[PDB]
Amino acid sequence: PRVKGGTVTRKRRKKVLKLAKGYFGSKHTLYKVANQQVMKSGNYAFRDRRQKKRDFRKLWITRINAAARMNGLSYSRLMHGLKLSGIEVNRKMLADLAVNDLTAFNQLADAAKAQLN
Amino acid sequence: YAIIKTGGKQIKVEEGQTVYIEKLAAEAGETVTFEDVLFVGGDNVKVGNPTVEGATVTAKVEKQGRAKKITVFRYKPKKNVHKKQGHRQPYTKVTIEKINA
Amino acid sequence: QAKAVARTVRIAPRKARLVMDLIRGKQVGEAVSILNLTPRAASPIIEKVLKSAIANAEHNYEMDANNLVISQAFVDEGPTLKRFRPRAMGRASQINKRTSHITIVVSEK
Amino acid sequence: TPMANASTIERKWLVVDAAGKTLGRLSSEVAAILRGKHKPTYTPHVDTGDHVIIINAEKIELTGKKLTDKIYYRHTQHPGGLKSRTALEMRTNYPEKMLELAIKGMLPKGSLGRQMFKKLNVYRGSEHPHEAQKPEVYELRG
Amino acid sequence: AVPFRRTSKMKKRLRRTHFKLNVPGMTECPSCGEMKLSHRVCKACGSYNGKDIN
Amino acid sequence: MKLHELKPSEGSRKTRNRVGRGIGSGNGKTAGKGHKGQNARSGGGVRPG
RNA sequence: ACCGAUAGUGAACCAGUACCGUGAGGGAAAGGUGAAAAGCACCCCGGAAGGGGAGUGAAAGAGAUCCUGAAACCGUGUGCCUACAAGUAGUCAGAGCCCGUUAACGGGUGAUGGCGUGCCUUUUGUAGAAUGAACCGGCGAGUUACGAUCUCGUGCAAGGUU
RNA sequence: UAUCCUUGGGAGUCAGACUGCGAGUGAUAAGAUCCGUAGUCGAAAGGGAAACAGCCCAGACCGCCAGCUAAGGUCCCAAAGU
RNA sequence: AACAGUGGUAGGAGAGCGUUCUAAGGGCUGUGAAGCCAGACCGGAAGGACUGGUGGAGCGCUUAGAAGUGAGAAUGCCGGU
């Protein structure tokens, strides 16, 4: 029996266009060009789910620098201090959540400064 | 205000607020205690890697669903490689209560 | 409101968006006059249709023709007429006659 | 879920004086202040810096032979269009581009670069017009 | 003499800025009241400046 | 054996290893016969021995 | 366990025609109103063409290459954004403003930041200044016939089978 | 520590590159060519070497707004000690 | 349950998705199917539904069998642009 192959295709090509909203110009009404862009998004949406493991550290660590220079300390003397102040686990994201409560943050800082000496 | 360890991640915890935390061993009606607590706050009582003593802040487990759908389409450009795998991450809608400060 | 369509009189649409990008929003009693000393000749189609567009509002609708403002007047292209102009060294260029559907929407101010 | 401050920033006015120091290490910790990297509420994209006024820029110093060596090259677009200027040329003729060009390289590039760059200004001598904002006095770490 | 690429739907529709045409100098016919072209004859009036000229 | 529930003994039926439909299954582009060989063209090639 | 109008006879239709060729020959394109022509009297606009009403029909957007009518493409409007920014055009952070859906760690824009050079063929090697495609839609490539051989599976087995 | 051999169905590959040591050809010229043994690439993304198949680290089932180190880095772009 | 492994081209191997047609059952349709048009639903994937709007007569599921079996690239054919 012969296959027409009528609606096998036209259902599939619009599962790519509906994943292709918002694009510049002629990449939201073409199959052959948005399919080079749904694919190309897939690497980008993959490999930039791992920079949130990186460019949040780079967002967290310089805030801890900034909390340290109003205390005279480094980023080194904090984290090397906190390994000896306690054996504390403060996971540099939530270190900033004490920074925005800076009255309580420096009790965590100057305790390590006493444990620097 | 607690900082509790559940699945290797910690969250700044306010009592009475829903926080999306990892899947665990409850059945949507339980009050699972969190014992790995540090920096209680408010009265500023910390214990430096022991946990804060006798302070096992509980919660109440509400709901366990799945996340918004994420599909990886990881293709290697030349030499004809595709890889198309969806991933529904499960979670637990955790309603937090009873700071045991 | 009113509605009137020219429907497939032969003029090319990209020679009919131009004057039609003046007429919309205007006063209808003024737009008869704006369509009179145009010199471009895509106007005696439209001025022969806007004059027909008023009469629908006057006969079929009696909506006080001095109180009308065109809300929409949009030109969409219609079906074409394909020719084969002969050219240099057997080349047979295609001349596409175009045809357009001049539409006019008349409403009360 | 961090705090990304966006235009809710209490900006500041610091003054860094240029008595006798080296313009690399005097533009060093100014450039962090131009983006406000010393401030604890540092978002990396919404310009959390604060304004910097430099006084007495022409009295700034250089060790080595850099008073004669470090030729500041600008270029036109016309062919063979470099225009050489040495340091002592920049120092005495007009030095109000002599610290700007030492920080234009040190602020990060992009649309946000020039947006942070507007916060800078440099006055020859002891002008300091600026009597309407209560500017503060800053001292560098070294 | 070859367009190296097709023109996209931006740089086409940025060329139709100064392809627009205006309304000409259009005043009112002082006698028969209708809209007049500036410094020409109001053909409905048949007049100019005082005289319906035959 | 009802007509509603026809099934074989498992191992007596086996689907096609059909050749040349998409790179997902493998055998997509080259269709199992490699790169540009004489052993890839339209029937041209070798005797058995 | 044939095709359903690019399929099936080249030809479902005035098709071996129309056209191309002096010539032997080559050789297209094009089916669908409804159940019933009941196919629009009548009134306006214009010379009509063509509408807008009215009336017909259950439907008139069903009205003459007349069912369904997608995409290219041409648009008319408006929600948010833009005239100191270079930017394979996305991603991921991300305020403001606009939102209220198959009711859930929502919808749409995104000022700005960080990483970032298409797909394919062929190559030791490609974003390639190596080829391929204007895009849009449809067709279009490892099939059966017979025998060989092996594994899996069936029934009888020192007999199996026509 | 488990991978070998035998029998049988099925292949593709027979144009390769470069860095170090061991030689030839050359001019102890080539990102040259002909090989030896060892890598990587080919078929292997990530980080550094500004960017870069072939060098220096290291292998990607997939998600997190967590933790530690290697190569290389810590005045500022561009994370970390003036 | 425990332990271990999961990059992959040529290349082998194993599982499934889906269209057309048939086969028994079942059902579902003028109280609106197929198609088409939209979305914020689910399944690991090819995918699959569910309301809403179009349309005006047919088509899904469960298990089987047959295949002209699924497009995005042929200086591709044929229209539309």
DSSP string, D8-25: -----EEEEE-SS-BHHH
The length of chain E is 54
* Six-digit token string for E22: 């205006």
In degrees and rounded to multiples of 5, residue F13 shows phi and psi of -130, 150
* Burial bucket for residue D28 (CB in 10 Å: 0-12, 13-18, 19+): middle
Chain B: residue whose CA lies nearest to A107: B44
The residues, ordered by sequence, that sit 6+ positions from B7 with a Cβ below 8 Å of its Cβ are: B21, B22, B24
Does A78 lie at the interface with D, CB-CB under 8 angstroms?
no
Asked if A12 CB < 7 A from strand I, the reply is yes
A96/D37 touch (CB, cutoff 8 Å), yes or no = no
Chain A: residue whose CA lies nearest to E11: A25
Q: Resolution in A, one decimal? A: 4.5
What is the rounded distance in angstroms from the CA atom of residue D112 to the CA atom of residue D99? 20
Residues C88, C109 contacting (CB under 8 angstroms):
no
B48/A39 touch (CB, cutoff 8 Å), yes or no = no
* Chain F interface, best mutation among B80, B83, B84, by max F CB count within 10 A: B80
Does E38 lie at the interface with C, CB-CB under 8 angstroms?
no
Residue with tokens 């009137």: C4
Nearest-by-Cβ selection for A86 from B49, B72, B75: B49
* Chain B interface, best mutation among A97, A102, A113, by max B CB count within 10 A: A97
Does E44 lie at the interface with C, CB-CB under 8 angstroms?
no
In degrees, to the nearest 5, what angle opens at C-alpha D126 toward C-alphas D123 and D128? Answer: 60
Residues A54, A47 contacting (CB under 8 angstroms):
no
* Six-digit token string for F33: 């016969």
Q: Distance from residue C57 (CA) to nucleotide I56 (C1'), in Å?
A: 35
* Six-digit token string for C70: 């065109």
Residues C6, C77 contacting (CB under 8 angstroms):
no
Would you tell me how many other CB atoms lie within 10 Å of the CB of residue D114?
11
**b/e sequence C56-66, b meaning 16+ C-beta within 10 Å:** ebeeeeebeee
Q: Which of residues 1-49 of F touch strand G (CB under 7 A)?
A: 9, 11-12, 14, 16, 18-21, 29-31, 33, 35-36, 40, 42
Region class of B16: left (phi > 0), else alpha (psi between -120 and 50), else beta? left
Asked if A7 CB < 7 A from strand I, the reply is yes
Instruction: Please tell me the number of Cα atoms within 13 Å of A20 on its side-chain side.
Output: 22
Question: Which experimental technique did the depositors report for determining this structure?
Answer: cryo-EM
What is the rounded distance in angstroms from the CA atom of residue C46 to the CA atom of residue C57? 16
Cα–Cα distances in Å, from B29 out to B17, B25, B67? 16, 11, 20
What is the rounded distance in angstroms from the CA atom of residue A108 to the CA atom of residue A85? 9
Chain A: residue whose CA lies nearest to B43: A104
The length of chain A is 117
* Burial bucket for residue E17 (CB in 10 Å: 0-12, 13-18, 19+): exposed
List the single protein residue with the shortest CA to C1' distance from I63: F5
Nearest-by-Cβ selection for A62 from D2, D3, D42: D42
> Residue A47, SS3?
helix
Would you tell me how many other CB atoms lie within 10 Å of the CB of residue E44?
15
Residues C13, C100 contacting (CB under 8 angstroms):
yes
Q: Which of residues 55-114 of A touch strand I (CB under 7 A)?
A: none
Pair type for strands D136-137 and D13-17: parallel
DSSP 8-state assignment for residue E8: -
Q: Which nucleotides of G are covered by protein (CB under 7 A)?
A: 1-5, 7, 43-53, 70-77, 84-96, 104-106, 108-116, 118-123, 126-127, 133-143, 152-154
Does A94 lie at the interface with D, CB-CB under 8 angstroms?
no
The distance in angstroms from the start CA to the end CA of chain E is 56
Residues C28, C69 contacting (CB under 8 angstroms):
yes
Pair type for strands D13-17 and D51-55: parallel
* Six-digit token string for E46: 């048949």
* Six-digit token string for C13: 């649409």
Using a CB-CB distance cutoff of 8 angstroms, which residues of chain B are in contact with residue A109? Answer: none
Q: Which of residues 3-42 of A touch strand G (CB under 7 A)?
A: 4-6, 9-10, 13, 21-24, 26-27, 29-33, 36-37, 39-41
**DSSP assignments along C12-74, one per residue:** -GGGTTTGGGTSTTSBHHHHHHHTTS--STTHHHHHHHHHHHHHIIIIIS---GGGEEEEE--
Using a CB-CB distance cutoff of 8 angstroms, which residues of chain C are in contact with residue E34? Answer: 33
The residues, ordered by sequence, that sit 6+ positions from B3 with a Cβ below 8 Å of its Cβ are: A94, B10, B11, B12, B13, B37, B38, B39, B41
* Six-digit token string for D142: 């070294």
Does D3 lie at the interface with A, CB-CB under 8 angstroms?
yes
Where are any strands of DSSP class E within chain B?
2-5, 10-13, 18-21, 59-63, 70-73, 84-87, 92-96
Q: To which H or E segment does residue A43 belong?
A: helix A31-47
A26/E10 touch (CB, cutoff 8 Å), yes or no = no
Using a CB-CB distance cutoff of 8 angstroms, which residues of chain E are in contact with residue C31? Answer: none
Region class of C15: left (phi > 0), else alpha (psi between -120 and 50), else beta? alpha
